[PDB]
Design a protein around this nucleic acid. Sequence first.
RNA 1: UCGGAGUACAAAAAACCCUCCGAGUGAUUUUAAUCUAGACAAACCAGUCAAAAUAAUCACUUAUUGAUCCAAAAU
Lengths: 48, 143, 95, 114
Amino acid sequence: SKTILVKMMSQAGTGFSFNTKRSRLREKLTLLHYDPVVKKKVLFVEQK
Amino acid sequence: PVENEAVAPEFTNRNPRNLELLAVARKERGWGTVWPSREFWHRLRVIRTQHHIEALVEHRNGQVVVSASTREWAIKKHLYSTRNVVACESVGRVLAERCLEAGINFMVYHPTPWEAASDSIKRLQHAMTEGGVVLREPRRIYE
Amino acid sequence: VTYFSSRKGKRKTVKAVIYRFLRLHSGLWLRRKAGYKKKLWKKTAARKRRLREFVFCNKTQSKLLDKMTTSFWKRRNWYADDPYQKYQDRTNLKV
Amino acid sequence: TGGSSKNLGGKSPGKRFGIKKMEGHYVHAGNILATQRHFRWHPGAHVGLGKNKCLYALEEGVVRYTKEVYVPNPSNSEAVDLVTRLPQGAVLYKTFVHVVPAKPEGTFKLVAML
RNA sequence: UCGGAGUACAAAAAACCCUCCGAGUGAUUUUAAUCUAGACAAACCAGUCAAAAUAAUCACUUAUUGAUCCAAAAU
Ligand SMILES: [Mg+2]
Ligand SMILES: [Mg+2]
Ligand SMILES: [Mg+2]
Ligand SMILES: [Mg+2]
């Protein structure tokens, strides 16, 4: 099995997260994270 | 000017109650391998004996500040069956009354995971709230 | 380091020191922290913060970096808007 | 002759675990008191516990060591059971570190007389 | 190279082609944030804790990791 590096995109602005994911894909990656610009809790979507 | 005019630079406030009431006092942030958390100015303590219900308020010094116990002839003669949930409501609002008279509106309570579900304690806390006494101690200023 | 050049007979400077370091006029040298752009998804928030920071070098280093730099980089500089200009003087130092 | 020794990787540096400050040492807020891999000493009054089980001082003060009674958190189960099976007379003891505050908390200064 | 024992018995440190076990990742969910006192450790480089001020866990848990330069990428 392998580990995939994925780049998450925020709904608003240029904020971008970088995190690791599993080959088998136990839990598909969708987050609630922190955006600096609006100073908010956000929904981050898995991207490349 | 006046013979009373003099004040002097650094003022002595000699009562131990002061800094605590100002919220600028110390707690002991610490322990934390142990239980319960010893960070507080005033800790509500409820001991349930197989016979009597006793409720205390304590200072970190161990001193018992204000208490309501059943073996007290006052509460003893006024009601029935010491171990009752009713008697816990009673001791609750007696300690509420006595707390306001002592002018302490803030103390912390750390019940046990199993204790927190019993009726006696929920009614202790309701008696306390209706009494006007706030649990969950106010934070420290510049901790 | 070239202690005497061919054409001018002067003393040359090592440019690789000029690209990674900064000399304040106090004599303190100021450098980035190694590996701060490297493999971020592995590291903790703590380590990332520690890596983004600038830091100061011990006497042994500042001394060495000074030998690789000519008079021109030890010069006093007033730039318009200079961020570090507030950091170039030493204050309250009782040795 | 074949000289293979089958063992590998004995070599690590030591981690310098141990006690950094000693009883009756003056301390400033933030100093690490001791650093251990298992709990040898537990944090007492005014001593904070780091996620790696470091002990640091919370106040400005004098470090004191103590043997005290140990009453585990009802949330932590192993310790709860260890406490459970003991014979009815015995209590558990551990070693703690403490800071004893030196500086008073504050001072009242006269700013202006109007 | 990296970590647990012993050797190295009670602060630290401490060798061998010494004696023995491990790691070059899994499993989840709760996505584990900024900014700054004081510190451990340390030749250097790297490593570690962390109050105040703003708004990760389990697997002995400790080891799961590679510096510049140069490349590709988007912000
Ligand atoms: Mg890769
Ligand atoms: Mg060893
Ligand atoms: Mg060694
Ligand atoms: Mg905080």
